[PDB]
Structures are given as C-alpha cells and as structure tokens.
Design a protein around this motif. Structure first.
Motif, PDB file in Angstrom:
ATOM      1  N   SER A  66       0.829  -1.197   0.000  1.00 35.66           N
ATOM      2  CA  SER A  66       0.000   0.000   0.000  1.00 35.66           C
ATOM      3  C   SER A  66       0.873   1.260   0.000  1.00 35.66           C
ATOM      4  N   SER A  67       2.199   1.118   0.115  1.00 36.26           N
ATOM      5  CA  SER A  67       3.039   2.298   0.265  1.00 36.26           C
ATOM      6  C   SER A  67       3.696   2.654  -1.063  1.00 36.26           C
ATOM      7  N   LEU A  68       3.391   1.877  -2.119  1.00 40.15           N
ATOM      8  CA  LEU A  68       4.025   2.093  -3.420  1.00 40.15           C
ATOM      9  C   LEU A  68       3.594   3.429  -4.041  1.00 40.15           C
ATOM     10  N   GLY A  69       2.360   3.842  -3.788  1.00 36.47           N
ATOM     11  CA  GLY A  69       1.867   5.112  -4.293  1.00 36.47           C
ATOM     12  C   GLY A  69       2.081   6.235  -3.275  1.00 36.47           C
ATOM     13  N   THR A  70       2.633   5.872  -2.122  1.00 40.50           N
ATOM     14  CA  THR A  70       2.501   6.670  -0.929  1.00 40.50           C
ATOM     15  C   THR A  70       3.855   7.137  -0.387  1.00 40.50           C
ATOM     16  N   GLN A  71       4.957   6.586  -0.895  1.00 36.10           N
ATOM     17  CA  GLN A  71       6.252   6.914  -0.325  1.00 36.10           C
ATOM     18  C   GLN A  71       7.246   6.985  -1.462  1.00 36.10           C
ATOM     19  N   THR A  72       8.301   7.792  -1.306  1.00 37.28           N
ATOM     20  CA  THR A  72       9.380   7.812  -2.282  1.00 37.28           C
ATOM     21  C   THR A  72      10.474   6.884  -1.773  1.00 37.28           C
ATOM     22  N   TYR A  73      11.053   6.089  -2.668  1.00 38.20           N
ATOM     23  CA  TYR A  73      12.121   5.198  -2.264  1.00 38.20           C
ATOM     24  C   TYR A  73      13.331   5.505  -3.143  1.00 38.20           C
ATOM     25  N   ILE A  74      14.458   5.804  -2.479  1.00 36.31           N
ATOM     26  CA  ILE A  74      15.707   6.132  -3.148  1.00 36.31           C
ATOM     27  C   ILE A  74      16.806   5.280  -2.539  1.00 36.31           C
ATOM     28  N   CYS A  75      17.513   4.591  -3.424  1.00 40.13           N
ATOM     29  CA  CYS A  75      18.758   3.943  -3.027  1.00 40.13           C
ATOM     30  C   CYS A  75      19.924   4.907  -3.280  1.00 40.13           C
ATOM     31  N   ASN A  76      20.792   4.973  -2.265  1.00 43.93           N
ATOM     32  CA  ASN A  76      21.953   5.826  -2.239  1.00 43.93           C
ATOM     33  C   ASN A  76      23.136   4.885  -2.422  1.00 43.93           C
ATOM     34  N   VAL A  77      23.795   4.999  -3.567  1.00 42.85           N
ATOM     35  CA  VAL A  77      24.890   4.103  -3.916  1.00 42.85           C
ATOM     36  C   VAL A  77      26.191   4.888  -3.862  1.00 42.85           C
ATOM     37  N   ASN A  78      27.147   4.382  -3.085  1.00 45.61           N
ATOM     38  CA  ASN A  78      28.422   5.070  -2.883  1.00 45.61           C
ATOM     39  C   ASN A  78      29.554   4.172  -3.364  1.00 45.61           C
ATOM     40  N   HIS A  79      30.374   4.686  -4.293  1.00 45.43           N
ATOM     41  CA  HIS A  79      31.556   3.965  -4.744  1.00 45.43           C
ATOM     42  C   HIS A  79      32.794   4.854  -4.625  1.00 45.43           C
ATOM     43  N   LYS A  80      33.442   4.730  -3.471  1.00 37.85           N
ATOM     44  CA  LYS A  80      34.535   5.609  -3.068  1.00 37.85           C
ATOM     45  C   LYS A  80      35.715   5.463  -4.026  1.00 37.85           C
ATOM     46  N   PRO A  81      36.097   4.240  -4.485  1.00 38.31           N
ATOM     47  CA  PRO A  81      37.227   4.110  -5.400  1.00 38.31           C
ATOM     48  C   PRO A  81      37.131   4.921  -6.690  1.00 38.31           C
ATOM     49  N   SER A  82      35.924   5.295  -7.085  1.00 36.32           N
ATOM     50  CA  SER A  82      35.838   6.146  -8.260  1.00 36.32           C
ATOM     51  C   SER A  82      35.216   7.469  -7.846  1.00 36.32           C
ATOM     52  N   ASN A  83      35.182   7.703  -6.526  1.00 37.89           N
ATOM     53  CA  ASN A  83      34.566   8.893  -5.956  1.00 37.89           C
ATOM     54  C   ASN A  83      33.192   9.158  -6.580  1.00 37.89           C
ATOM     55  N   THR A  84      32.342   8.116  -6.680  1.00 31.37           N
ATOM     56  CA  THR A  84      31.026   8.194  -7.305  1.00 31.37           C
ATOM     57  C   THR A  84      29.929   8.064  -6.242  1.00 31.37           C
ATOM     58  N   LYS A  85      28.931   8.945  -6.316  1.00 26.76           N
ATOM     59  CA  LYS A  85      27.718   8.817  -5.517  1.00 26.76           C
ATOM     60  C   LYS A  85      26.507   8.867  -6.438  1.00 26.76           C
ATOM     61  N   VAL A  86      25.611   7.885  -6.330  1.00 26.95           N
ATOM     62  CA  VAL A  86      24.410   7.842  -7.162  1.00 26.95           C
ATOM     63  C   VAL A  86      23.190   7.697  -6.260  1.00 26.95           C
ATOM     64  N   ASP A  87      22.240   8.617  -6.377  1.00 31.23           N
ATOM     65  CA  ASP A  87      20.914   8.386  -5.819  1.00 31.23           C
ATOM     66  C   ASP A  87      19.945   7.972  -6.932  1.00 31.23           C
ATOM     67  N   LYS A  88      19.282   6.817  -6.776  1.00 37.67           N
ATOM     68  CA  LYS A  88      18.346   6.394  -7.809  1.00 37.67           C
ATOM     69  C   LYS A  88      16.951   6.190  -7.238  1.00 37.67           C
ATOM     70  N   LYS A  89      15.978   6.979  -7.695  1.00 37.49           N
ATOM     71  CA  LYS A  89      14.616   6.799  -7.229  1.00 37.49           C
ATOM     72  C   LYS A  89      14.030   5.542  -7.902  1.00 37.49           C
ATOM     73  N   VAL A  90      13.321   4.715  -7.132  1.00 32.42           N
ATOM     74  CA  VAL A  90      12.824   3.439  -7.612  1.00 32.42           C
ATOM     75  C   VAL A  90      11.305   3.467  -7.579  1.00 32.42           C
ATOM     76  N   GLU A  91      10.680   3.385  -8.761  1.00 32.63           N
ATOM     77  CA  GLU A  91       9.243   3.585  -8.910  1.00 32.63           C
ATOM     78  C   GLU A  91       8.585   2.356  -9.525  1.00 32.63           C
ATOM     79  N   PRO A  92       7.298   2.081  -9.195  1.00 33.30           N
ATOM     80  CA  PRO A  92       6.511   1.029  -9.859  1.00 33.30           C
ATOM     81  C   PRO A  92       6.591   0.995 -11.392  1.00 33.30           C
TER      82      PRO A  92
END
Lengths: 212, 77, 214
Positions: C188-214
């Motif tokens: 019931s929370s799929l329409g109701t909440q934002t979900y973001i994975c925060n991906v950190n890759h220090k060896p390439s000094n990379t940070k990615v936030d990816k919003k994950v949607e239905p």
C-alpha cells in the motif's frame, strides 16, 4: 606442507548452547604450536587460544582448547551473541605456516520458506544493450536453496550468478539473489522468464515468472 | 642490566640461531651453544649451531644482573 | 600501544607488482618478526612469509615461487611486502602480523588488512538500475559493472533500514562486480512513499541516488 582440516565446515547453534569444533593436522604437531583465531566479517583475525589451551588476552573462559598430536578441538561451553563468527586453527610446527579452512558458527532458527519475487530488466538498462533479470528469495532459513532459470521453458546454464546475505541482524534469516544476464537481442526474442525455487520450507518448488 | 636481543628468534632445525647480549657474562635457559664477544666489547653473540627442536624455549643472559627473557623456536624441517 | 598499520587498498593489472607497507608502532621494532598472510574470498588464510628486523632474515612460502620480496625500512619501522607478476588469483586482503611473548606462534597483533584487486578491468563507478515493484512488495537497485570493490548502499539517506538486504558483490565474467540491494515495504506504500537507493563507490569517488518507482 602440514595441511589442517577443520570439522564441521559450518554449524548452527543457539545462545547458551555448547559447541565443539575440530582441527586435524596431516602431520603430528607439538601442542605448543597449535593456535585458534576468531574472525568476524570485515575484521582481521583475533587470536583466541594459543598453545592448544591457553586463552589469549581478554578472551572469556567459556572458550577452551584441547588436543595434541594431530587432533585438536575448540569448545565454547555457553555461547554468547558475539561468538557467532568464523574460527580458524593454525600450526607454527613447520614452515610453511598453515591455517585450517575455517568453521563458521551460525545462529539456529526455525525453518522459514522464502518469499519469491522477480524483476524484469529496467527500461533504463535495456537502452544499453543488456538485460539483467533478478529473482529474489527473501527471509528464508536454512541457507540451502536451489534456483533455476527458464526462458521459454529452456533451462539456463552459465549465464546466471547467485549471491546470499549473511544471517539477518534481526531475524537470522538469509536472502538470495539470482541474476540472469542476457543480451537485449536475446531478451527481446523470448516471452516467459521464470525463476524456479526449491527450498525445504516449501512442500513443492515455486515458480515466479513474467511475460515480457 | 644486560640487553638480550631479539625477543623472538625462529629457525628451522639444523639452522643457526644467534642472539645478542649487550652490556662475567652467562647464557641461561629457563656444545652447539657458543659465546663470542664482538670487537666492540659491549656486544656478545650467543649462538646455537645445528639447532634442535628441543632447543626451543626461553633464555636470558646474566652478568647477578639478568636480561629480559627471550624465546627460541626451532621448527621441524 | 602495539599497532600494525598497513597501506591502503590497491588495484593492479595482471603482470604488475604491488608493494604493501606495514608500519609497526609501540615496541622495539627489532624484537619480533613481521609475518604476512592473505585471505582470498574462497581460499581462507594463506601464509606468505616473514621478515625479522633483528637480522634481516626472511622466510617465504615456496608457493609464491620467488614472486614475493620482503624488505625493511628501519628508519620508519616499516616492513614491505612486494608481490610481483600479479595474477587474478592474487586478489585478496593482505595482512601483516606479529607474535608476543609466549604466544608460541600465535599472532597477537594484526594490521587492519590491505585489499589488493588484480584484474584487467578498470576503476569505474556502477550503473544503477531500478528493481521496480509490481501485503508486501519488494523493490531494489541493481548496482552493476563497477570496479573495484567496495560499494555501499543505503535507502532514503539512512531512514529506511528495516527489511533492507544488500547482497555481497559477485564478480561477473566481464571482470566487473555487480550487486543488488533490496527492501520489502507495504505494498500500500508504493503510491505513498518515495524510495531512493543511495549508492556510494569511493574508489571512483562516485555517488548515485536512484529513485525506484513502480
């Protein structure tokens, strides 16, 4: 070299139980030169017992060591939470120094069937020429599980890989991902992607599938 | 108080092991065993030739002033 | 205050050399040998050799076939492990260690470990792809084709921890790592909440936030 073999390779037990792990050397070692380490994930080993039976600095007396010749044991006579870890034996009797393969002490828990879920490739990924298909086994116990991929009923081999988590910090279950990797071309030529799961907690194997 | 170096020597049986005592000077354990004074006169070699597994153990030099203990380990070939 | 401090994680191409440092603190550097080991994902623990600052004596595991050299800098109480002609199978955490009085061969003090990754791959951040959901729903992020390890992953900048599982990386045949991180939430929370994975890759000094949607 003097090979060391630990038994069992894995065992599951509870807080308060007592367990014994075994180290067996291919060649007789003077017991002064046989030691035990505890290793926790992401940490260096920590010496636990030196010279068969002497506790290292700061090691609780629920640990004990015994043995001589080729047969050695480590016992934990009343497990604590901190004790679930991998244990290794080591010989300083001859060069080269050798270590056993390790015994992993895990938390015992009731049987739980996985929840299974499946994920088609994202459109984002399909733009790049690759399709990954992911099947998730969630919150199951024990760790033994079988996953098979079928594309249009053809069993896949050599193009999938599995990963399993450590026991969960809360419920001590495992989770498993299996990732099927195909070319976009291949992905687009087939219709039905099915992940087949066998686990002792289910009576019959469960398929989760989708049509492209 | 003499210095006895190093704190740990590890050799294979049949090898030589040479501790250094730095300061009547004696080598104790708590033929094949030799003492040699070096040219400088302050430092002495306390050597085991053709080391045996039963040589493994704890040693000191004393002048009664005793050094800290050191350990010899003689592994199996 | 005895401590062994090792140099940082290293990436190498096949055929290259690595030199890992172990700097000894807190005792008379010449009193104890420094021992070297390594731990590869599926091999457990392997002894490499040792070096005694007292007399510069070295012992080596013959398995290395003269590919390892141990050297010292007394001035900086540091022992060096140099491993040459690197192969894929040399990927491991490398440790230095020492005994203490009366441990009879037991390693009391350990350095923190140095990851050495050997591969033809090149250092790069991951592609991050949604594992889109469709009582309970699972969703996640596929963190694919990065090198070397590690990445870390959080959800909603740390506010979503419950039901999270981040799988161990697998090495793909390509030579690049991949992992997924998943979470289960009320459907019931799929329409109701934002979900973001925060991906950190220090060896390439990379940070990615990816919003994950239905």
């Amino acid at each position: 070299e003097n090979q060391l073999t630990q038994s069992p390779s894995s065992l599951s037990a509870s807080v308060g139980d007592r367990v014994t792990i075994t180290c067996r050397a291919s060649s007789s070692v003077i017991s002064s030169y046989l030691h035990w380490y505890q290793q926790k994930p992401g940490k260096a080993p920590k010496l636990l017992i030196y010279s068969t039976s002497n506790l290292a600095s700061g090691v609780p007396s629920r640990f004990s060591g015994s043995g001589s010749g080729t047969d050695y044991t480590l016992t934990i006579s009343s497990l604590q939470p901190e004790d679930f870890a991998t244990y290794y034996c080591q010989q300083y009797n001859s060069y080269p120094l050798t270590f056993g393969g390790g015994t992993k002490l895990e938390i015992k828990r009731t049987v739980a069937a996985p929840s299974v879920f499946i994920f088609p490739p994202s459109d984002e990924q399909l733009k790049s020429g690759t399709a990954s298909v992911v099947c998730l086994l969630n919150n199951f116990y024990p760790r033994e599980a079988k996953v098979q991929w079928k594309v249009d009923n053809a069993l896949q081999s050599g193009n999938s890989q599995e990963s399993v988590t450590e026991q969960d910090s809360k419920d001590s279950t495992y989770s498993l991902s299996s990732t099927l990797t195909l070319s976009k071309a291949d992905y687009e030529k087939h219709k039905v992607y099915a992940c087949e799961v066998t686990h002792q907690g289910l009576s019959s194997p469960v398929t989760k599938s989708f049509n492209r | 108080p003499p210095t006895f170096s190093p704190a740990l020597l590890v050799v294979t049986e049949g090898d030589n092991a040479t501790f250094t005592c730095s300061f009547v000077l004696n080598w104790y354990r708590m033929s094949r065993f030799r003492v040699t004074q070096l040219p400088n006169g302050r430092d002495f070699h306390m050597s085991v030739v053709r080391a045996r597994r039963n040589d493994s153990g704890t040693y000191l030099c004393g002048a009664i002033k005793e050094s800290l203990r050191a350990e010899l380990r003689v592994t199996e070939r | 205050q005895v401590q062994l401090v090792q140099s940082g994680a290293e990436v190498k191409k096949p055929g290259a050399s690595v030199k890992v440092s172990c700097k000894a603190f807190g005792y008379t550097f010449t009193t104890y040998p420094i021992e070297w080991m390594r731990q590869a994902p599926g091999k457990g623990l392997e002894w490499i050799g040792n070096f005694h600052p007292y007399n510069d004596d070295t012992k080596y595991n013959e398995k290395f076939q003269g590919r390892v050299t141990l050297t010292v800098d007394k001035s900086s109480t540091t022992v060096y492990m140099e491993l040459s002609s690197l192969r894929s199978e040399d990927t491991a955490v490398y440790y230095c260690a020492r005994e203490n009085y009366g441990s009879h061969g037991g390693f009391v003090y350990w350095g923190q470990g140095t990851l050495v990754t050997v591969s033809s791959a090149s250092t790069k951040g991951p592609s991050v792809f949604p594992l889109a959901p469709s009582g309970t729903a699972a969703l996640g992020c596929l963190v694919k084709d990065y090198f070397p390890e590690p990445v870390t992953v959080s959800w909603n900048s740390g506010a979503l921890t419950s039901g999270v599982h981040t799988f161990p990386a697998v090495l793909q045949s390509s030579g690049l790592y991949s992992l997924s991180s998943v979470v289960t939430v009320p459907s019931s929370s799929l329409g109701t909440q934002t979900y973001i994975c925060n991906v950190n890759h220090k060896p390439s000094n990379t940070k990615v936030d990816k919003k994950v949607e239905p």
